[PDB]
Amino acid sequence: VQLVESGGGLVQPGGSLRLSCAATGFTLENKAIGWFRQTPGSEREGVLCISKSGSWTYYTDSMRGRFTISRDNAENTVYLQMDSLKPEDTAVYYCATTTAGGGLCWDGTTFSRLASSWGQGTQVTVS
């Protein structure tokens, strides 16, 4: 079982990107998927999580309206849309899911430490 990311890229400020988190081997409909960003030499930080029941938990307190999240069950994929991109958004982005924690988003530190599957990471650069 694995989580596969894509949709990264490099755009000017003001652009937008949509990241995807695709599951092979299991159905995301019953799980919570959380997104995190990291730059080398700094700790991961939560962005946004969608629970099994579909609630959105914002780990970040910055620019909440720019980040949106959706689940496509037909494709077994979760999407993170990022609008109005700024240079400070440049980072590697990861999705993650937990088997423990039972479909809840928790908070950012808890979810990241509990996570049992990680995406491979995708580069987002705003220049």
Side-chain angles (χ1 to χ4, degrees):
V1 294
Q2 48 165 347
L3 296 169
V4 178
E5 286 176 64
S6 48
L10 189 150
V11 299
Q12 285 188 309
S16 83
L17 295 170
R18 194 167 81 160
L19 314 187
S20 58
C21 186
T24 313
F26 51 103
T27 285
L28 295 173
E29 185 167 340
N30 194 18
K31 305 204 188 343
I33 295 90
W35 291 86
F36 301 79
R37 52 173 285 173
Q38 189 176 27
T39 55
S42 298
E43 66 281 338
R44 277 170 191 181
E45 91 190 46
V47 180
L48 170 59
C49 170
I50 182 161
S51 72
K52 155 189 173 170
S53 56
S55 59
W56 300 9
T57 301
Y58 280 98
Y59 302 140
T60 182
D61 66 344
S62 184
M63 294 276 189
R64 289 174 197 97
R66 301 196 291 119
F67 295 105
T68 58
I69 192 158
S70 68
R71 183 194 267 116
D72 193 339
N73 296 308
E75 281 292 335
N76 202 36
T77 300
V78 165
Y79 295 97
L80 180 72
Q81 186 143 313
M82 303 181 293
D83 299 323
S84 305
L85 281 168
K86 282 150 184 57
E88 69 187 312
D89 290 320
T90 292
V92 184
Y93 285 74
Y94 297 94
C95 61
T97 195
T98 84
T99 47
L104 299 154
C105 285
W106 298 97
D107 59 36
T109 304
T110 300
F111 192 103
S112 59
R113 293 164 164 190
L114 290 172
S116 57
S117 306
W118 283 92
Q120 81 284 9
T122 189
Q123 194 176 336
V124 168
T125 304
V126 181
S127 197

PDB file of all heavy atoms in Angstrom, residues 30-34 36 49-55 57 59 71 96-108 110-112 114-115:
ATOM      1  N   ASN A  30     -12.435   6.058   3.885  1.00  0.00           N
ATOM      2  CA  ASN A  30     -12.510   5.730   5.303  1.00  0.00           C
ATOM      3  C   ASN A  30     -11.357   6.321   6.118  1.00  0.00           C
ATOM      4  O   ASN A  30     -11.180   5.947   7.281  1.00  0.00           O
ATOM      5  CB  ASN A  30     -12.538   4.202   5.460  1.00  0.00           C
ATOM      6  CG  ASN A  30     -12.957   3.752   6.849  1.00  0.00           C
ATOM      7  OD1 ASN A  30     -13.541   4.519   7.613  1.00  0.00           O
ATOM      8  ND2 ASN A  30     -12.657   2.498   7.184  1.00  0.00           N
ATOM      9  N   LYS A  31     -10.559   7.226   5.550  1.00  0.00           N
ATOM     10  CA  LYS A  31      -9.374   7.713   6.246  1.00  0.00           C
ATOM     11  C   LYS A  31      -9.318   9.238   6.240  1.00  0.00           C
ATOM     12  O   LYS A  31     -10.009   9.915   5.472  1.00  0.00           O
ATOM     13  CB  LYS A  31      -8.086   7.138   5.632  1.00  0.00           C
ATOM     14  CG  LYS A  31      -8.055   5.612   5.561  1.00  0.00           C
ATOM     15  CD  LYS A  31      -6.633   5.071   5.525  1.00  0.00           C
ATOM     16  CE  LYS A  31      -6.619   3.560   5.253  1.00  0.00           C
ATOM     17  NZ  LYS A  31      -7.959   2.930   5.508  1.00  0.00           N
ATOM     18  N   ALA A  32      -8.496   9.771   7.135  1.00  0.00           N
ATOM     19  CA  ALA A  32      -8.140  11.181   7.145  1.00  0.00           C
ATOM     20  C   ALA A  32      -6.816  11.366   6.419  1.00  0.00           C
ATOM     21  O   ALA A  32      -5.870  10.606   6.631  1.00  0.00           O
ATOM     22  CB  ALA A  32      -8.020  11.727   8.572  1.00  0.00           C
ATOM     23  N   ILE A  33      -6.740  12.397   5.587  1.00  0.00           N
ATOM     24  CA  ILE A  33      -5.530  12.699   4.839  1.00  0.00           C
ATOM     25  C   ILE A  33      -5.096  14.102   5.225  1.00  0.00           C
ATOM     26  O   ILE A  33      -5.872  15.058   5.093  1.00  0.00           O
ATOM     27  CB  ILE A  33      -5.763  12.590   3.319  1.00  0.00           C
ATOM     28  CG1 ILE A  33      -6.076  11.143   2.939  1.00  0.00           C
ATOM     29  CG2 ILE A  33      -4.553  13.093   2.531  1.00  0.00           C
ATOM     30  CD1 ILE A  33      -7.555  10.815   2.987  1.00  0.00           C
ATOM     31  N   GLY A  34      -3.856  14.234   5.656  1.00  0.00           N
ATOM     32  CA  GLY A  34      -3.319  15.514   6.062  1.00  0.00           C
ATOM     33  C   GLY A  34      -2.151  15.900   5.180  1.00  0.00           C
ATOM     34  O   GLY A  34      -1.383  15.045   4.724  1.00  0.00           O
ATOM     35  N   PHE A  36       1.306  18.402   4.777  1.00  0.00           N
ATOM     36  CA  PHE A  36       2.384  19.053   5.500  1.00  0.00           C
ATOM     37  C   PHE A  36       3.377  19.616   4.498  1.00  0.00           C
ATOM     38  O   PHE A  36       3.511  19.099   3.390  1.00  0.00           O
ATOM     39  CB  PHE A  36       3.108  18.043   6.449  1.00  0.00           C
ATOM     40  CG  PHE A  36       2.190  17.438   7.432  1.00  0.00           C
ATOM     41  CD1 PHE A  36       1.352  16.413   7.070  1.00  0.00           C
ATOM     42  CD2 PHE A  36       2.108  17.942   8.717  1.00  0.00           C
ATOM     43  CE1 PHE A  36       0.459  15.878   7.986  1.00  0.00           C
ATOM     44  CE2 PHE A  36       1.217  17.427   9.608  1.00  0.00           C
ATOM     45  CZ  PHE A  36       0.394  16.388   9.237  1.00  0.00           C
ATOM     46  N   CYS A  49      -6.012  19.260   6.692  1.00  0.00           N
ATOM     47  CA  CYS A  49      -6.379  17.851   6.765  1.00  0.00           C
ATOM     48  C   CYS A  49      -7.871  17.723   6.502  1.00  0.00           C
ATOM     49  O   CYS A  49      -8.660  18.594   6.880  1.00  0.00           O
ATOM     50  CB  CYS A  49      -6.023  17.237   8.162  1.00  0.00           C
ATOM     51  SG  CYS A  49      -6.678  15.552   8.498  1.00  0.00           S
ATOM     52  N   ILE A  50      -8.258  16.640   5.847  1.00  0.00           N
ATOM     53  CA  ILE A  50      -9.663  16.322   5.658  1.00  0.00           C
ATOM     54  C   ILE A  50      -9.946  15.015   6.385  1.00  0.00           C
ATOM     55  O   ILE A  50      -9.202  14.042   6.228  1.00  0.00           O
ATOM     56  CB  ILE A  50     -10.046  16.241   4.169  1.00  0.00           C
ATOM     57  CG1 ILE A  50     -11.544  15.947   4.035  1.00  0.00           C
ATOM     58  CG2 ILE A  50      -9.215  15.180   3.431  1.00  0.00           C
ATOM     59  CD1 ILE A  50     -12.115  16.280   2.662  1.00  0.00           C
ATOM     60  N   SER A  51     -11.005  14.994   7.193  1.00  0.00           N
ATOM     61  CA  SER A  51     -11.280  13.797   7.981  1.00  0.00           C
ATOM     62  C   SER A  51     -12.103  12.800   7.170  1.00  0.00           C
ATOM     63  O   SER A  51     -12.599  13.101   6.085  1.00  0.00           O
ATOM     64  CB  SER A  51     -12.026  14.159   9.266  1.00  0.00           C
ATOM     65  OG  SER A  51     -13.348  14.519   8.957  1.00  0.00           O
ATOM     66  N   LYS A  52     -12.263  11.594   7.725  1.00  0.00           N
ATOM     67  CA  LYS A  52     -13.112  10.590   7.085  1.00  0.00           C
ATOM     68  C   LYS A  52     -14.512  11.129   6.844  1.00  0.00           C
ATOM     69  O   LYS A  52     -15.114  10.879   5.793  1.00  0.00           O
ATOM     70  CB  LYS A  52     -13.161   9.318   7.934  1.00  0.00           C
ATOM     71  CG  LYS A  52     -14.418   8.471   7.734  1.00  0.00           C
ATOM     72  CD  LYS A  52     -14.499   7.341   8.765  1.00  0.00           C
ATOM     73  CE  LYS A  52     -15.827   6.590   8.685  1.00  0.00           C
ATOM     74  NZ  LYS A  52     -15.805   5.347   9.510  1.00  0.00           N
ATOM     75  N   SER A  53     -15.046  11.892   7.787  1.00  0.00           N
ATOM     76  CA  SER A  53     -16.376  12.439   7.587  1.00  0.00           C
ATOM     77  C   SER A  53     -16.385  13.684   6.711  1.00  0.00           C
ATOM     78  O   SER A  53     -17.457  14.236   6.472  1.00  0.00           O
ATOM     79  CB  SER A  53     -17.024  12.749   8.938  1.00  0.00           C
ATOM     80  OG  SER A  53     -16.197  13.613   9.688  1.00  0.00           O
ATOM     81  N   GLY A  54     -15.237  14.154   6.234  1.00  0.00           N
ATOM     82  CA  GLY A  54     -15.227  15.309   5.359  1.00  0.00           C
ATOM     83  C   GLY A  54     -15.037  16.669   6.007  1.00  0.00           C
ATOM     84  O   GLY A  54     -15.076  17.673   5.295  1.00  0.00           O
ATOM     85  N   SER A  55     -14.809  16.752   7.314  1.00  0.00           N
ATOM     86  CA  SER A  55     -14.524  18.063   7.881  1.00  0.00           C
ATOM     87  C   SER A  55     -13.099  18.492   7.519  1.00  0.00           C
ATOM     88  O   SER A  55     -12.219  17.663   7.280  1.00  0.00           O
ATOM     89  CB  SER A  55     -14.730  18.062   9.396  1.00  0.00           C
ATOM     90  OG  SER A  55     -13.902  17.118  10.012  1.00  0.00           O
ATOM     91  N   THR A  57      -9.777  20.430   8.764  1.00  0.00           N
ATOM     92  CA  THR A  57      -9.042  20.984   9.889  1.00  0.00           C
ATOM     93  C   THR A  57      -7.825  21.739   9.377  1.00  0.00           C
ATOM     94  O   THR A  57      -6.941  21.141   8.753  1.00  0.00           O
ATOM     95  CB  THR A  57      -8.613  19.877  10.844  1.00  0.00           C
ATOM     96  OG1 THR A  57      -9.779  19.187  11.301  1.00  0.00           O
ATOM     97  CG2 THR A  57      -7.838  20.467  12.032  1.00  0.00           C
ATOM     98  N   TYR A  59      -4.414  23.200  10.049  1.00  0.00           N
ATOM     99  CA  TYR A  59      -3.263  23.254  10.940  1.00  0.00           C
ATOM    100  C   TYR A  59      -2.592  24.628  10.861  1.00  0.00           C
ATOM    101  O   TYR A  59      -2.241  25.211  11.885  1.00  0.00           O
ATOM    102  CB  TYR A  59      -2.266  22.144  10.587  1.00  0.00           C
ATOM    103  CG  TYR A  59      -2.778  20.710  10.637  1.00  0.00           C
ATOM    104  CD1 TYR A  59      -2.388  19.797   9.663  1.00  0.00           C
ATOM    105  CD2 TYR A  59      -3.618  20.252  11.667  1.00  0.00           C
ATOM    106  CE1 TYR A  59      -2.821  18.492   9.680  1.00  0.00           C
ATOM    107  CE2 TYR A  59      -4.068  18.923  11.691  1.00  0.00           C
ATOM    108  CZ  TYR A  59      -3.656  18.048  10.696  1.00  0.00           C
ATOM    109  OH  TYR A  59      -4.059  16.720  10.666  1.00  0.00           O
ATOM    110  N   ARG A  71     -11.870  15.309  -1.824  1.00  0.00           N
ATOM    111  CA  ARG A  71     -11.683  13.872  -1.920  1.00  0.00           C
ATOM    112  C   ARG A  71     -12.476  13.377  -3.120  1.00  0.00           C
ATOM    113  O   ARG A  71     -13.663  13.683  -3.250  1.00  0.00           O
ATOM    114  CB  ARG A  71     -12.131  13.172  -0.627  1.00  0.00           C
ATOM    115  CG  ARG A  71     -11.901  11.682  -0.634  1.00  0.00           C
ATOM    116  CD  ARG A  71     -12.637  10.989   0.478  1.00  0.00           C
ATOM    117  NE  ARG A  71     -11.797  10.860   1.653  1.00  0.00           N
ATOM    118  CZ  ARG A  71     -12.059  11.438   2.807  1.00  0.00           C
ATOM    119  NH1 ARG A  71     -13.154  12.173   2.940  1.00  0.00           N
ATOM    120  NH2 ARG A  71     -11.234  11.276   3.821  1.00  0.00           N
ATOM    121  N   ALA A  96      -0.272  12.494   3.959  1.00  0.00           N
ATOM    122  CA  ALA A  96      -0.049  11.451   4.957  1.00  0.00           C
ATOM    123  C   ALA A  96      -1.390  10.951   5.465  1.00  0.00           C
ATOM    124  O   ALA A  96      -2.397  11.673   5.456  1.00  0.00           O
ATOM    125  CB  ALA A  96       0.827  11.941   6.117  1.00  0.00           C
ATOM    126  N   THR A  97      -1.392   9.688   5.875  1.00  0.00           N
ATOM    127  CA  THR A  97      -2.582   9.042   6.394  1.00  0.00           C
ATOM    128  C   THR A  97      -2.168   8.171   7.574  1.00  0.00           C
ATOM    129  O   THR A  97      -1.022   7.720   7.659  1.00  0.00           O
ATOM    130  CB  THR A  97      -3.291   8.218   5.306  1.00  0.00           C
ATOM    131  OG1 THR A  97      -4.615   7.891   5.738  1.00  0.00           O
ATOM    132  CG2 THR A  97      -2.535   6.943   5.015  1.00  0.00           C
ATOM    133  N   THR A  98      -3.086   7.974   8.508  1.00  0.00           N
ATOM    134  CA  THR A  98      -2.807   7.159   9.684  1.00  0.00           C
ATOM    135  C   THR A  98      -3.745   5.959   9.711  1.00  0.00           C
ATOM    136  O   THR A  98      -4.907   6.057   9.304  1.00  0.00           O
ATOM    137  CB  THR A  98      -2.972   7.946  10.991  1.00  0.00           C
ATOM    138  OG1 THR A  98      -4.349   7.940  11.362  1.00  0.00           O
ATOM    139  CG2 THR A  98      -2.525   9.388  10.837  1.00  0.00           C
ATOM    140  N   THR A  99      -3.230   4.819  10.170  1.00  0.00           N
ATOM    141  CA  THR A  99      -4.123   3.710  10.489  1.00  0.00           C
ATOM    142  C   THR A  99      -4.637   3.812  11.915  1.00  0.00           C
ATOM    143  O   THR A  99      -5.839   3.654  12.153  1.00  0.00           O
ATOM    144  CB  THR A  99      -3.429   2.365  10.262  1.00  0.00           C
ATOM    145  OG1 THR A  99      -2.122   2.393  10.849  1.00  0.00           O
ATOM    146  CG2 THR A  99      -3.322   2.072   8.764  1.00  0.00           C
ATOM    147  N   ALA A 100      -3.752   4.099  12.866  1.00  0.00           N
ATOM    148  CA  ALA A 100      -4.204   4.554  14.166  1.00  0.00           C
ATOM    149  C   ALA A 100      -4.896   5.913  14.022  1.00  0.00           C
ATOM    150  O   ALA A 100      -4.889   6.537  12.963  1.00  0.00           O
ATOM    151  CB  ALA A 100      -3.029   4.633  15.140  1.00  0.00           C
ATOM    152  N   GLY A 101      -5.540   6.361  15.091  1.00  0.00           N
ATOM    153  CA  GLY A 101      -6.195   7.653  15.061  1.00  0.00           C
ATOM    154  C   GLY A 101      -7.583   7.676  14.449  1.00  0.00           C
ATOM    155  O   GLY A 101      -8.262   8.711  14.532  1.00  0.00           O
ATOM    156  N   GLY A 102      -8.003   6.598  13.785  1.00  0.00           N
ATOM    157  CA  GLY A 102      -9.382   6.343  13.367  1.00  0.00           C
ATOM    158  C   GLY A 102     -10.081   7.430  12.580  1.00  0.00           C
ATOM    159  O   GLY A 102     -11.189   7.834  12.942  1.00  0.00           O
ATOM    160  N   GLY A 103      -9.454   7.901  11.500  1.00  0.00           N
ATOM    161  CA  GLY A 103     -10.126   8.811  10.581  1.00  0.00           C
ATOM    162  C   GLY A 103     -10.264  10.237  11.063  1.00  0.00           C
ATOM    163  O   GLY A 103     -11.047  10.998  10.488  1.00  0.00           O
ATOM    164  N   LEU A 104      -9.539  10.613  12.106  1.00  0.00           N
ATOM    165  CA  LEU A 104      -9.563  11.953  12.659  1.00  0.00           C
ATOM    166  C   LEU A 104      -8.334  12.735  12.232  1.00  0.00           C
ATOM    167  O   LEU A 104      -7.258  12.167  12.014  1.00  0.00           O
ATOM    168  CB  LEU A 104      -9.590  11.906  14.185  1.00  0.00           C
ATOM    169  CG  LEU A 104     -10.778  11.213  14.828  1.00  0.00           C
ATOM    170  CD1 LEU A 104     -10.353  10.701  16.220  1.00  0.00           C
ATOM    171  CD2 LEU A 104     -11.926  12.189  14.921  1.00  0.00           C
ATOM    172  N   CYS A 105      -8.490  14.059  12.195  1.00  0.00           N
ATOM    173  CA  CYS A 105      -7.381  14.938  11.849  1.00  0.00           C
ATOM    174  C   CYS A 105      -6.469  15.282  13.033  1.00  0.00           C
ATOM    175  O   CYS A 105      -5.323  15.700  12.812  1.00  0.00           O
ATOM    176  CB  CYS A 105      -7.927  16.218  11.204  1.00  0.00           C
ATOM    177  SG  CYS A 105      -8.485  15.901   9.498  1.00  0.00           S
ATOM    178  N   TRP A 106      -6.934  15.117  14.277  1.00  0.00           N
ATOM    179  CA  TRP A 106      -6.119  15.468  15.439  1.00  0.00           C
ATOM    180  C   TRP A 106      -5.630  16.906  15.325  1.00  0.00           C
ATOM    181  O   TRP A 106      -6.369  17.784  14.868  1.00  0.00           O
ATOM    182  CB  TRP A 106      -4.946  14.481  15.578  1.00  0.00           C
ATOM    183  CG  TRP A 106      -5.425  13.085  15.807  1.00  0.00           C
ATOM    184  CD1 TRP A 106      -5.580  12.112  14.879  1.00  0.00           C
ATOM    185  CD2 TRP A 106      -5.835  12.516  17.059  1.00  0.00           C
ATOM    186  NE1 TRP A 106      -6.064  10.969  15.464  1.00  0.00           N
ATOM    187  CE2 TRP A 106      -6.222  11.191  16.806  1.00  0.00           C
ATOM    188  CE3 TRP A 106      -5.903  13.001  18.364  1.00  0.00           C
ATOM    189  CZ2 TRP A 106      -6.681  10.344  17.811  1.00  0.00           C
ATOM    190  CZ3 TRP A 106      -6.362  12.164  19.364  1.00  0.00           C
ATOM    191  CH2 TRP A 106      -6.749  10.851  19.079  1.00  0.00           C
ATOM    192  N   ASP A 107      -4.404  17.173  15.733  1.00  0.00           N
ATOM    193  CA  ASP A 107      -3.741  18.412  15.350  1.00  0.00           C
ATOM    194  C   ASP A 107      -2.485  18.052  14.559  1.00  0.00           C
ATOM    195  O   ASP A 107      -2.188  16.871  14.338  1.00  0.00           O
ATOM    196  CB  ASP A 107      -3.446  19.301  16.564  1.00  0.00           C
ATOM    197  CG  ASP A 107      -2.537  18.624  17.619  1.00  0.00           C
ATOM    198  OD1 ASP A 107      -1.607  17.864  17.263  1.00  0.00           O
ATOM    199  OD2 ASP A 107      -2.753  18.877  18.824  1.00  0.00           O
ATOM    200  N   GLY A 108      -1.748  19.082  14.135  1.00  0.00           N
ATOM    201  CA  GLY A 108      -0.673  18.875  13.171  1.00  0.00           C
ATOM    202  C   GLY A 108       0.441  17.982  13.692  1.00  0.00           C
ATOM    203  O   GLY A 108       0.837  17.016  13.037  1.00  0.00           O
ATOM    204  N   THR A 110       0.407  15.835  16.278  1.00  0.00           N
ATOM    205  CA  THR A 110      -0.065  14.479  16.538  1.00  0.00           C
ATOM    206  C   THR A 110      -0.230  13.693  15.246  1.00  0.00           C
ATOM    207  O   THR A 110       0.251  12.556  15.134  1.00  0.00           O
ATOM    208  CB  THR A 110      -1.384  14.517  17.309  1.00  0.00           C
ATOM    209  OG1 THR A 110      -1.186  15.193  18.548  1.00  0.00           O
ATOM    210  CG2 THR A 110      -1.882  13.108  17.586  1.00  0.00           C
ATOM    211  N   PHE A 111      -0.906  14.286  14.246  1.00  0.00           N
ATOM    212  CA  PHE A 111      -1.153  13.554  13.011  1.00  0.00           C
ATOM    213  C   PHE A 111       0.162  13.183  12.343  1.00  0.00           C
ATOM    214  O   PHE A 111       0.317  12.066  11.846  1.00  0.00           O
ATOM    215  CB  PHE A 111      -2.039  14.389  12.060  1.00  0.00           C
ATOM    216  CG  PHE A 111      -2.580  13.619  10.891  1.00  0.00           C
ATOM    217  CD1 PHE A 111      -3.890  13.196  10.880  1.00  0.00           C
ATOM    218  CD2 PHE A 111      -1.789  13.338   9.787  1.00  0.00           C
ATOM    219  CE1 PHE A 111      -4.417  12.507   9.781  1.00  0.00           C
ATOM    220  CE2 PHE A 111      -2.313  12.651   8.678  1.00  0.00           C
ATOM    221  CZ  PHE A 111      -3.623  12.233   8.680  1.00  0.00           C
ATOM    222  N   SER A 112       1.133  14.100  12.344  1.00  0.00           N
ATOM    223  CA  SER A 112       2.379  13.811  11.645  1.00  0.00           C
ATOM    224  C   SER A 112       3.161  12.704  12.349  1.00  0.00           C
ATOM    225  O   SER A 112       3.737  11.840  11.687  1.00  0.00           O
ATOM    226  CB  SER A 112       3.232  15.076  11.515  1.00  0.00           C
ATOM    227  OG  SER A 112       3.540  15.614  12.784  1.00  0.00           O
ATOM    228  N   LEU A 114       1.711  10.290  14.260  1.00  0.00           N
ATOM    229  CA  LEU A 114       0.964   9.045  14.121  1.00  0.00           C
ATOM    230  C   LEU A 114       0.982   8.471  12.717  1.00  0.00           C
ATOM    231  O   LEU A 114       0.685   7.281  12.563  1.00  0.00           O
ATOM    232  CB  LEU A 114      -0.498   9.238  14.524  1.00  0.00           C
ATOM    233  CG  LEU A 114      -0.858   9.467  15.988  1.00  0.00           C
ATOM    234  CD1 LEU A 114      -2.319   9.822  16.075  1.00  0.00           C
ATOM    235  CD2 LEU A 114      -0.573   8.220  16.811  1.00  0.00           C
ATOM    236  N   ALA A 115       1.311   9.275  11.694  1.00  0.00           N
ATOM    237  CA  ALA A 115       1.082   8.853  10.318  1.00  0.00           C
ATOM    238  C   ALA A 115       1.811   7.556  10.011  1.00  0.00           C
ATOM    239  O   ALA A 115       2.982   7.390  10.344  1.00  0.00           O
ATOM    240  CB  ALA A 115       1.526   9.943   9.330  1.00  0.00           C
TER     241      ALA A 115
END
